[PDB]
Each structure stands twice: as C-alpha cells, then as structure tokens.
Amino acid sequence: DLVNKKFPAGDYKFQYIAISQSDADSESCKMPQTVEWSKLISENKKVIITGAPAAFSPTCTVSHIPGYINYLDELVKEKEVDQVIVVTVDNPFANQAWAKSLGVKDTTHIKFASDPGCAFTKSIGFELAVGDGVYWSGRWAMVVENGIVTYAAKETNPGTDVTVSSVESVLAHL
Amino acid sequence: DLVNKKFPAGDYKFQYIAISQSDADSESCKMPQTVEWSKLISENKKVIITGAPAAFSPTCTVSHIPGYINYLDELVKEKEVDQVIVVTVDNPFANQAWAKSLGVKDTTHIKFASDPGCAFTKSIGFELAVGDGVYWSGRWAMVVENGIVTYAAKETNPGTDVTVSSVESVLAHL
C-alpha cells in the first residue's frame, strides 16, 4: 500500500496551464508548464491529488470534481490545503478549458494536470484500462502531508461510484 | 507511400460523439460511438481525414481546423464530400466539446474522432512524438475516394506550419 510511505514521486512530471485574473473568463495564449511531482510535494506541506477518467465527462454523469471546486475555499482557508491537483491523461490545453468550464478562475491552489500516457497514475496502480493498451486515470484521491501519503483510495467502478474519492471522504482525513 | 493504395483500415477503430439539432448549443448526455475505419470508408465514396495534435489548442496558435469548418458547406454541397473526420488522440468527450467550441452544430458530415493511443495515426507514420513514449497526432490531411487514398501529407513542423494539411491544399485535390 502507499499509506504512510513517502510520496513516490520518482522522476514523474505533470503539465498544467495557469488560470488567473485576466484570462479567467477569456481565452489564454499560454503554453504548458512542466512540474516534477517531487518539486510540487517538496514545496507544499499539504496536498490533495485526485484522478479523473476524462476531461469533459458529460455533466449527466457522476463526478467527484465539482465537489472539490465547491469546497476549495474551506480546503484552503480552514483546512490549510496548499494545492489541489486534478489529474487526467488528457492534454493540458483541454484540461485547462475543462477547469474554466467548471468555474475555475484561479489556479493558485487548484491545478488541472496532465499525466502524459498515464505514467504516474499507472505507477501507483490507480489507472483505468479502456482497451488496447490504452489507459485513462481511474477515479481516486490522495492526501500528502509533509511528503507522506496519509490517505489513498480508488473507486471500484469509476463509471458509477463517488465514495472514497469524494471531497467529503477526504475532508474526514485532513 | 500511401497514395494510390487502398486505404489501410486494418482493424483500427475510432470514437466520436454526435452533435445535432437540440444538443448543438447545450450539454449532451451521450456516450461515444465506436466506428471501424473500414466501415466508414466502405460506406462513403469521398472522405477527408485530417489529424490535429491537440483538442483545445489555443486560438493564438496556428490551426488548419477552422478552415475545414468554414469550408464545410462547399465541401459537402459543391465538392460532394461525404465525411470530414478530424483526428486526435484525445478522449471523445473532449473532442466533442472542442468541436462545439469551434462552431460545429451538426456531425452529419463532420466528426471529431479519437484515435485511442494514436494507434491508427502511428500506423500510417503521421504521429507526433511528444516525449517519454507518448504520441499525439501530427498535422496532416488525407483524401480517400472509393476506398483509395488520392492524397496524403503531413506537416514538417505541426507547431508552426499549415500548408499541405490546409483545406485549400486539399481542395486542389478533390
């Protein structure tokens, strides 16, 4: 298991695009930033990381993501969360557009990351096989405090289940 | 080369979501359809296929895709094109959202496909290596008439070049 071991960053890296004041409600001309998982974790004492199968998942379908967005103020203000990282294998531009559609106006404390080719997600066994050697991220959530995993769980059916990956389940562990 | 040779469909398949009358300007609750390349090609005498590196590429960067959308009427009405298929490795939900953002209200003659894991695109040598064993589609375009490739070309620099993949270059070949 991962729980109570150091966050297994390895050489894995993720990409995201920032959203801020001006470009929040308009179109950005911004190239992706690349960030090593070890750097993110080294620089932030309290980090939530949550995987999602697909950017632009239809709103009719079950999701844990809106919950994290709704709860962000409490996470950052009352629960001292430094970062919330939403993870998909989707390209960073699509992840960013998706974040904006969901109401994100500021990525200071929440970032929508690409895990290219599901490499990090496969490495911690939280992937979702979709066919033919292709992997999306499953639905899962992780808490990292001071470089140490204090909670990690993935859904049995990412299609239908929002339980252990929910912001509420996670709140109980922070 | 591919030109003048039967379209190499193999067992490759793609996924897309439809857009139509009602859901054109709203949110669909629709799952992806899977379509075999051989079926698409068997059922349509004149097909254009064009690869793009990334759904939601920023508007500030070069793109051949808006051209195809602008020119769709002429393609379907005057040039008798049955299908225009835009190909990315991105998930079909993201591809659909992308299409709508670009002004597509009807997928009768234009579909935004996922080529999962870049498998079809790799097979014809039109892929774009982005690092660490991960492949996006390059920028390219192909004309298939009566099951036979009559044009196929990819950009040397998909980042900066819209030449051989442009709707204009393709128009000259229909």
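qc> The longest strand of chain B covers residues 148-154.
qc> done
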